[PDB]
Design a protein around this ligand. Structure first.
Ligand SMILES: [Mg+2]
Ligand SMILES: [Mg+2]
Ligand SMILES: [Mg+2]
Ligand SMILES: [Mg+2]
Ligand SMILES: [Mg+2]
Ligand SMILES: [Mg+2]
Ligand SMILES: [Mg+2]
Ligand SMILES: [Mg+2]
Lengths: 136, 61, 213, 98
RNA sequence: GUCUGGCACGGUGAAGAGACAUGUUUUUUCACUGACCCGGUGAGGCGGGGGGGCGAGCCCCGAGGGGCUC
RNA sequence: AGACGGACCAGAGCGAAAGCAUUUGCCAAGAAUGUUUUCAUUAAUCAAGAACGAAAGUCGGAGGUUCGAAGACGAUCAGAUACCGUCGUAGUUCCGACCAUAAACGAUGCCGACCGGCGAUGCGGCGGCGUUAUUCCCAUGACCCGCCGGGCAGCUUCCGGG
């Protein structure tokens, strides 16, 4: 009896918590509180090599797996919360965010309230690299 | 999840040598839904494809 | 191996009576095994949720926090914990070739609730204006910060948190701060941002229920 | 040979200025050099828009944007093909394009 | 000499879980004090209570009372 | 727990220069403007001499998140005791004394006069139609339109030079 409030229209909310960046991509479904977790998934658990972890393909596969494990419990709707590395890094999303999100919708998960969440430090510590940066 | 699609218009060549080409397509089962894809070989407006990865949403190469 | 979810229980969360829609989404807890009781491990979660979905006649760019405090019969009755604004809006307001003003304060309401308030305002461009800039001088700004702190203290040292939230929802604090300062500079855009709650008294159950009844 | 009159940096009457750090390069440059740029992009990028708005829960859901300030080096910029070199007389235009 | 396990000095109560086999003791945790130990003092005003009242704020309130916090 | 003070931040302001950015309070200085106040040539530039002087660095205490010369490893390479990645000492932080250098650049000594225009910006003073202001009409900015001073800069030219 997983959410036994049976009305066939009482949508059950969760949140997704996408953390996208370079070299990785995470999809971490939780409840309204973020304290209880449901099938955290990545991009590295699907592909073989290490230089194709952060591809939209591995992102798409992850959401399809998550959506499967999520519809097996009565969770129907979601709220989306997006994140970049932040701190003193790029603080722009990576190339796995677009692909993952779209694959949830077209799989069917009745989403609302997509928003961003990212640190944005006011004037925090000194960044790595050393005054001339990486001189490739 | 094998699919079909007809072609609407050709955009431009691409690739390191001008062998692939950009196109726009509708899926022959719903008319509103649409994507753009890379193909190889002589392709004209008025054609039909056998798509396997139903969604890629490719860009400039 | 056994799936670790079969031994769990879906409960419900419940909001106070100041809000029209009192019924929100659900949560889940684990059952009771010796120590580590459900209600104890359930006490203290914080359900960030918007304000449109509580009222459906109100703005969307606000958030309330709504900690839980007590439980009775698979329904978690909450209390106020905090307020917060939304970032898309905040970054939208911050524009260029104008001036930004900020202020804050600490005050203790009638009860023992101590809380720290924050405010913000932006200067305006008159509709016939050409000079592109619309900056201010430092002096008259000091007046405005001073004027903010007066208004908040006046409003908050009089009431205990049922009145105060009913001001916050249609934020009249800032609509009045707008009205005051328009004889110095206009300040078209004004808000109360953040209402973190620094200290709280003990748990008086009778107070909670009659608020939540 | 002064290639420029500004000397490349809009100081004109200070003495000293604070630095910043390139968002890619990671190097330490002043705030009057160090090309600026401002992003007001959406989040879904013109492709999945129809899919979301049909699979929503709300009614048409205005769908927020994303805001960023960007700093670039001079070196990292030209390699990114933001700006380009110019000829002698056209260096003296302080206008951006449409 | 020193580390460590066990029996005795070793008492009161409450929760959780066991091996046998269909209760036994066991145990981990919380609390108590009366054995035991420690410090201070010329063993000098401890706890409840209302005879307290100089006052305050919370209730009923004959505005005069007593109830609560001090 | 210790550092840092984002976006607002501008060919905008201040300071002898080095250099200066969260709130508030205190302490003592200063430019410009305004002036039918005052003293009456008291001044400009300056060998010797004297104050201040980024970063690194040295000395004695307190502290030690982040970054990271040295230093050790893993890769690329014909070789790399470098460019890359992971760790990581001195130092980076505050209090008190030393040193006195830089593309310390406007690569342009200070004082004073004269010599062409135009539209702006920042401070102060003088005025004028009008709009708002605020709470019933005034003195506050805000613009609207001009002027005057002394400032940071800018566009244009057969002034004239080179
Ligand atoms: Mg300098
Ligand atoms: Mg000399
Ligand atoms: Mg130094
Ligand atoms: Mg030093
Ligand atoms: Mg030392
Ligand atoms: Mg390191
Ligand atoms: Mg020298
Ligand atoms: Mg020189």
């Amino acid at each position: 009896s997983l959410g036994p409030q049976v009305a066939e229209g009482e949508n059950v909310f969760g949140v997704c918590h996408i953390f996208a960046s370079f070299n990785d991509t995470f999809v971490h479904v939780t409840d309204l509180s973020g304290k209880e977790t449901i099938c955290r998934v990545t991009g590295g658990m699907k592909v073989k090599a290490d230089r194709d972890e952060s591809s939209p393909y591995a992102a798409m596969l992850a959401a399809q797996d998550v959506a499967q494990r999520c519809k097996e419990l009565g969770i129907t709707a979601l709220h989306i919360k997006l994140r970049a590395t932040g701190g003193n890094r790029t603080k722009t999303p990576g190339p796995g965010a677009q692909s993952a999100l779209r694959a949830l919708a077209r799989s069917g998960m009745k989403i609302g309230r997509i928003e961003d969440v990212t640190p944005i430090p006011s004037d925090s510590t000194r960044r790595k690299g050393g005054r001339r940066g990486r001189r490739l | 999840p094998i699919k079909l699609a007809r072609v609407t218009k050709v955009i431009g060549k691409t690739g390191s040598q001008g062998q692939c080409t950009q196109v726009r397509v509708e899926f022959m089962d719903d008319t509103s839904h649409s994507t753009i894809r890379n193909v190889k070989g002589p392709v004209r407006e008025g054609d039909v494809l056998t798509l396997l990865e139903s969604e890629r949403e490719a860009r400039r190469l | 191996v056994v799936d670790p979810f079969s031994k769990k229980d879906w409960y419900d969360v419940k909001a106070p009576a100041m809000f029209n829609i009192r019924n929100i989404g659900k949560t889940l807890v684990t059952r009771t095994q010796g120590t580590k009781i459900a209600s104890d491990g359930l006490k203290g979660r914080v359900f960030e949720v918007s304000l449109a979905d509580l009222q459906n006649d109100e703005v969307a760019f606000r958030k309330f926090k709504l900690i839980t405090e007590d439980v009775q019969g698979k329904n978690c009755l909450t209390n106020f914990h905090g307020m917060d604004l939304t970032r898309d809006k905040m970054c939208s307001m911050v524009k260029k070739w104008q001036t930004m003003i900020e202020a804050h304060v600490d005050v203790k309401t009638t009860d023992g609730y101590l809380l720290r308030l924050f405010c913000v305002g932006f200067t305006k461009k008159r509709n016939n204006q050409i000079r592109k800039t619309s900056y201010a001088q430092h002096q008259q700004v000091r007046q405005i910060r001073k004027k903010m702190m007066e208004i908040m203290t006046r409003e908050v040292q009089t009431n205990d948190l049922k009145e105060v939230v009913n001001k916050l929802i249609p934020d009249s604090i800032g609509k009045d701060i707008e009205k005051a300062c328009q004889s110095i500079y206009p300040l078209h855009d004004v808000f109360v941002r953040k209402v973190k709650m620094l200290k709280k008294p003990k748990f008086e159950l009778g107070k909670l229920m009659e608020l939540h009844g | 040979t002064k290639k420029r009159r500004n000397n490349g940096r809009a100081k004109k009457g200070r003495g000293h200025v604070q630095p910043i750090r390139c968002t890619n390069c990671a190097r330490c440059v002043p705030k009057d050099k160090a090309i600026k740029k401002f992003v007001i992009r959406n989040i879904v990028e013109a492709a999945a828009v129809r899919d979301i708005s049909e699979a929503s829960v709300f009614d048409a859901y205005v769908l927020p944007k994303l805001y960023v300030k960007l700093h670039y080096c001079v070196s990292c910029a030209i390699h990114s093909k933001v700006v380009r070199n110019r000829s002698r007389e056209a260096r003296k235009d302080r206008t951006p394009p449409p």
